[PDB]
Design an enzyme around this catalytic site. Structure first.
Site, PDB file in Angstrom:
ATOM      1  N   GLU A  60       0.829  -1.194   0.000  1.00  9.62           N
ATOM      2  CA  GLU A  60       0.000   0.000   0.000  1.00  9.62           C
ATOM      3  C   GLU A  60       0.872   1.256   0.000  1.00  9.62           C
ATOM      4  O   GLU A  60       0.643   2.168  -0.791  1.00  9.62           O
ATOM      5  CB  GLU A  60      -0.950   0.001   1.201  1.00  9.62           C
ATOM      6  N   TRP A  82      -8.311  -1.403  -0.778  1.00 10.81           N
ATOM      7  CA  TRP A  82      -9.086  -0.378  -1.471  1.00 10.81           C
ATOM      8  C   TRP A  82     -10.142  -0.835  -2.481  1.00 10.81           C
ATOM      9  O   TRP A  82     -10.805  -0.002  -3.107  1.00 10.81           O
ATOM     10  CB  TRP A  82      -8.136   0.625  -2.110  1.00 10.81           C
ATOM     11  N   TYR A 146      -4.485   9.076  -1.680  1.00  6.74           N
ATOM     12  CA  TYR A 146      -3.177   9.596  -1.261  1.00  6.74           C
ATOM     13  C   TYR A 146      -2.122   9.770  -2.322  1.00  6.74           C
ATOM     14  O   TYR A 146      -1.455  10.799  -2.348  1.00  6.74           O
ATOM     15  CB  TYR A 146      -2.587   8.804  -0.088  1.00  6.74           C
ATOM     16  N   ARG A 178      11.252  24.543   9.042  1.00  4.99           N
ATOM     17  CA  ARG A 178      10.043  24.219   9.797  1.00  4.99           C
ATOM     18  C   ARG A 178       8.845  24.248   8.866  1.00  4.99           C
ATOM     19  O   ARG A 178       7.717  24.384   9.313  1.00  4.99           O
ATOM     20  CB  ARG A 178       9.792  25.235  10.893  1.00  4.99           C
ATOM     21  N   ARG A 179       9.096  24.135   7.568  1.00  6.85           N
ATOM     22  CA  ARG A 179       8.028  24.160   6.582  1.00  6.85           C
ATOM     23  C   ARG A 179       7.933  22.844   5.804  1.00  6.85           C
ATOM     24  O   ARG A 179       7.217  22.766   4.807  1.00  6.85           O
ATOM     25  CB  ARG A 179       8.251  25.334   5.629  1.00  6.85           C
ATOM     26  N   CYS A 198      -8.082  10.570   6.341  1.00  2.31           N
ATOM     27  CA  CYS A 198      -7.902  10.546   7.785  1.00  2.31           C
ATOM     28  C   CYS A 198      -6.531  11.073   8.154  1.00  2.31           C
ATOM     29  O   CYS A 198      -6.364  11.718   9.192  1.00  2.31           O
ATOM     30  CB  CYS A 198      -8.036   9.116   8.316  1.00  2.31           C
ATOM     31  N   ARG A 218      -7.057  13.013  11.733  1.00  2.00           N
ATOM     32  CA  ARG A 218      -8.331  13.532  12.225  1.00  2.00           C
ATOM     33  C   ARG A 218      -9.237  12.505  12.895  1.00  2.00           C
ATOM     34  O   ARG A 218      -9.980  12.836  13.825  1.00  2.00           O
ATOM     35  CB  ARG A 218      -9.103  14.208  11.094  1.00  2.00           C
ATOM     36  N   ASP A 221      -9.642   4.626  14.267  1.00  7.72           N
ATOM     37  CA  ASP A 221     -10.286   3.403  14.736  1.00  7.72           C
ATOM     38  C   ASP A 221      -9.170   2.714  15.529  1.00  7.72           C
ATOM     39  O   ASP A 221      -8.282   2.087  14.946  1.00  7.72           O
ATOM     40  CB  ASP A 221     -10.673   2.580  13.505  1.00  7.72           C
ATOM     41  N   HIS A 259     -11.082   6.705  18.558  1.00  6.84           N
ATOM     42  CA  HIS A 259     -12.233   5.964  19.047  1.00  6.84           C
ATOM     43  C   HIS A 259     -12.179   4.455  18.939  1.00  6.84           C
ATOM     44  O   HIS A 259     -11.642   3.900  17.991  1.00  6.84           O
ATOM     45  CB  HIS A 259     -13.470   6.428  18.308  1.00  6.84           C
ATOM     46  N   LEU A 260     -12.850   3.811  19.876  1.00  9.71           N
ATOM     47  CA  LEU A 260     -12.946   2.371  19.931  1.00  9.71           C
ATOM     48  C   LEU A 260     -14.414   2.040  19.678  1.00  9.71           C
ATOM     49  O   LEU A 260     -15.271   2.434  20.458  1.00  9.71           O
ATOM     50  CB  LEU A 260     -12.547   1.915  21.330  1.00  9.71           C
TER      51      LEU A 260
HETATM   52  N1  LIG Z   1      -6.116   2.930   8.464  1.00  8.56           N
HETATM   53  C1  LIG Z   1      -7.170   3.647   8.866  1.00  8.56           C
HETATM   54  C2  LIG Z   1      -8.298   3.871   7.986  1.00  8.56           C
HETATM   55  C3  LIG Z   1      -9.454   4.440   8.541  1.00  8.56           C
HETATM   56  N2  LIG Z   1      -9.516   4.748   9.821  1.00  8.56           N
HETATM   57  C4  LIG Z   1     -10.873   4.987  10.331  1.00  8.56           C
HETATM   58  C5  LIG Z   1     -11.187   6.292  11.067  1.00  8.56           C
HETATM   59  C6  LIG Z   1     -12.693   6.165  11.259  1.00  8.56           C
HETATM   60  O1  LIG Z   1     -12.904   5.028  12.105  1.00  8.56           O
HETATM   61  C7  LIG Z   1     -13.259   5.739   9.910  1.00  8.56           C
HETATM   62  C8  LIG Z   1     -13.553   6.962   9.042  1.00  8.56           C
HETATM   63  O2  LIG Z   1     -14.762   7.614   9.544  1.00  8.56           O
HETATM   64  P1  LIG Z   1     -14.974   9.155   9.314  1.00  8.56           P
HETATM   65  O3  LIG Z   1     -14.609   9.615   7.970  1.00  8.56           O
HETATM   66  O4  LIG Z   1     -16.350   9.636   9.596  1.00  8.56           O
HETATM   67  O5  LIG Z   1     -14.016   9.624  10.322  1.00  8.56           O
HETATM   68  O6  LIG Z   1     -12.050   4.984   9.390  1.00  8.56           O
HETATM   69  C9  LIG Z   1      -8.432   4.581  10.670  1.00  8.56           C
HETATM   70  O7  LIG Z   1      -8.438   4.882  11.855  1.00  8.56           O
HETATM   71  N3  LIG Z   1      -7.263   4.036  10.162  1.00  8.56           N
HETATM   72  N1  LIG Z   2       1.792  34.366  16.485  1.00  8.06           N
HETATM   73  C1  LIG Z   2       2.814  33.691  15.951  1.00  8.06           C
HETATM   74  C2  LIG Z   2       3.435  34.133  14.719  1.00  8.06           C
HETATM   75  C3  LIG Z   2       4.632  33.511  14.333  1.00  8.06           C
HETATM   76  N2  LIG Z   2       5.178  32.566  15.073  1.00  8.06           N
HETATM   77  C4  LIG Z   2       6.581  32.267  14.750  1.00  8.06           C
HETATM   78  C5  LIG Z   2       6.998  30.826  14.445  1.00  8.06           C
HETATM   79  C6  LIG Z   2       8.450  31.024  14.030  1.00  8.06           C
HETATM   80  O1  LIG Z   2       9.139  31.531  15.179  1.00  8.06           O
HETATM   81  C7  LIG Z   2       8.457  32.186  13.045  1.00  8.06           C
HETATM   82  C8  LIG Z   2       8.201  31.685  11.623  1.00  8.06           C
HETATM   83  O2  LIG Z   2       9.413  31.030  11.133  1.00  8.06           O
HETATM   84  P1  LIG Z   2       9.306  29.908  10.037  1.00  8.06           P
HETATM   85  O3  LIG Z   2       8.361  30.212   8.958  1.00  8.06           O
HETATM   86  O4  LIG Z   2      10.599  29.535   9.409  1.00  8.06           O
HETATM   87  O5  LIG Z   2       8.801  28.844  10.912  1.00  8.06           O
HETATM   88  O6  LIG Z   2       7.250  32.937  13.579  1.00  8.06           O
HETATM   89  C9  LIG Z   2       4.576  32.099  16.232  1.00  8.06           C
HETATM   90  O7  LIG Z   2       5.033  31.204  16.928  1.00  8.06           O
HETATM   91  N3  LIG Z   2       3.384  32.674  16.644  1.00  8.06           N
END
Ligand SMILES: Nc1ccn([C@H]2C[C@H](O)[C@@H](COP(=O)(O)O)O2)c(=O)n1
Ligand SMILES: Nc1ccn([C@H]2C[C@H](O)[C@@H](COP(=O)(O)O)O2)c(=O)n1
Lengths: 316, 316
Positions: A60, A82, A146, A178-179, A198, A218, A221, A259-260
């Protein structure tokens, strides 16, 4: 042991877990906000307290790294995770002229008659996706999964962005950035999508010569999904690390709705009565460096001695 | 006290914090992966150990909720947080025919002469943005700032999506949804943007009649930035809760790269020697419900008794 955080997550949700209705109709026990930390230098986070299929995880993940969105590749590797999704599409178009494959999934688990009929029909579909080259293109391509989010993000100007590729390049040129984020969430698409991703996004981090990764999931399971999710992203961390010639740091798993499902409680407690064993090792082909060119035989999991598999119904 | 998690974050970064170079050239002490939990039913998370300007937080947040991206509104409210960014653009175009405002910011802090010249030039710019209606449209509009990310996401088909609005509607119709996410990260834009958004995304959650929110901040300046960030999102949580007629749950703050700039260590330890006082209360206009129509006078912070302000240089 290395998997202790996962068992801890299983406990508290059982304890603190407040009931909460859900999308399907099997209630759930939920918590919101939680983070786990897996030190990848101490072993590979594949659960030993219950046999997890590592074969399914590699195939996968490779499918993802190839920017692929077609189910033929997975089937080609005996992976059927899938299928259901591509199948739903097939069944709902003017071309399908078979049985009552309508609102199937739930009904399959409901009664014996259908469970067989559905399995017969599904197999047929898979067969065509495997050999009818044109069919594979129509009903085998999932579209926005994905693979295309990570490697072919569609822009408002007709182009496609290779997020992961560029992030890998940033790691090599600006390690202390940090980006180094990769996003799977696109506001334009989530509105109509079958299943919004998810694994919303993940961030990379470099320090002391080690690469770490944090994931934001987000929804999770806890019984059936989490054991896989940890493995796919822990694996990914190893891969990127290998390509960039870095040491592995940690994998940090952050959750929104963990969640469980109510119909998994016995199995979960069943699983909480065993003692975790030492963690398996992961060794990767030292000749190959560009992970986008990896094959199954390039990833080897060493001495994974797990407890038997625990079966449980899918919450539908 | 309610702010204890923030002081704990200040401690460990000082302790566990491993040095790490950064974008600017002031070193940093960094950690990766961390989560904080603020129970909003116990008070409002505005720091009492150091005076934080709540006035600046409201005005900025309203600017966001109005889908606005123009600096005129902020100036109109004595807020100057986003000036520098719009200013950079002005100074770099064929229309600017003034002094050596080149690579300014760093130089301002460098020597007295410039610190004044720059302040004179800046003031002039602000004046035009405030009265020269057409100038405000050219050099006053930041373009891709939160306001347009949250309420006017540009699609690949020429339209705009109101993410926040729709999410608010989802809360009201499907409270137990695990898809109540709002994203500020757009792969198409981050490549050229001046500053990719730090507050990458946030997720909403409903249970037991209470609304909670989790934030994912890729990067965080522990001394100067975090005290503000907590306040803006804790406030936002209250607002959405009010509009949807729900009780407040918690605010969960998750970080990617949390860091303390090296030139802030004394101030941070200076701050760690005080005892947090009881948390202030937040009361909102009960007559108004649509938060998109809120004004400064609608949000009232009650009895906030903080320690004096602590000054520190901006890491440039
Ligand atoms: N490998 C994966 C694939 C899916 N989900 C789970 C999250 C939720 O249990 C459900 C998606 O529901 P919903 O879209 O409403 O969050 O699938 C997960 O945890 N891990
Ligand atoms: N209210 C805010 C605004 C900005 N930053 C900070 C995060 C980093 O210190 C810098 C952004 O740097 P970079 O983009 O390289 O992370 O700004 C923060 O913590 N809180």
């Amino acid at each position: 042991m290395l998997e202790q955080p996962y068992l801890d997550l299983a406990k508290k949700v059982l304890d603190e877990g407040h009931f909460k209705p859900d999308r399907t109709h099997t209630g759930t026990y939920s918590i919101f906000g939680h983070q786990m930390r897996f030190d990848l230098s101490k072993g590979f986070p594949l659960l030993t307290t219950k046999k997890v299929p590592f074969g399914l995880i590699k195939s996968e993940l490779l499918w993802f790294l190839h920017g692929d969105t077609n189910i033929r590749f997975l089937l080609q590797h005996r992976n059927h995770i899938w299928d259901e999704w591509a199948f739903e599409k097939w069944v709902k178009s003017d071309e399908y002229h078979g049985p009552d494959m309508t609102d199937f999934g739930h009904r399959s688990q409901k009664d014996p008659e259908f469970a067989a009929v559905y399995h017969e029909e599904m197999a047929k579909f898979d067969d065509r996706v495997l050999h009818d080259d044109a069919f594979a293109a129509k009903y085998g391509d999932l579209g926005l999964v994905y693979g295309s989010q990570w490697r072919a993000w569609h822009t408002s100007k007709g182009d496609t962005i290779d997020q992961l590729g560029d992030v890998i390049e940033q790691i090599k040129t600006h390690p202390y950035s940090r980006r180094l984020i990769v996003s799977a969430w696109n506001p334009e698409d989530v509105p109509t999508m079958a299943l919004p991703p998810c694994h919303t996004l993940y961030q990379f981090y470099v320090n002391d010569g080690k690469l770490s990764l944090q994931l934001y999931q987000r929804s999770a399971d806890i019984f059936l999904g989490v054991p896989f999710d940890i493995a796919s992203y822990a694996l990914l961390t190893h891969l990127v690390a290998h390509e960039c010639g870095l040491e592995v740091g940690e994998f940090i798993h952050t959750f929104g709705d963990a969640h469980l499902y109510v119909n998994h409680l016995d199995q979960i407690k069943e699983q909480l009565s065993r003692t975790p064993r030492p963690a398996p090792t992961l060794q990767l082909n030292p000749d190959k460096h560009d992970i986008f060119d990896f094959d199954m035989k390039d990833i080897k999991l060493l001495n994974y001695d797990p407890y038997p598999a625990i079966k449980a119904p899918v919450a539908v």
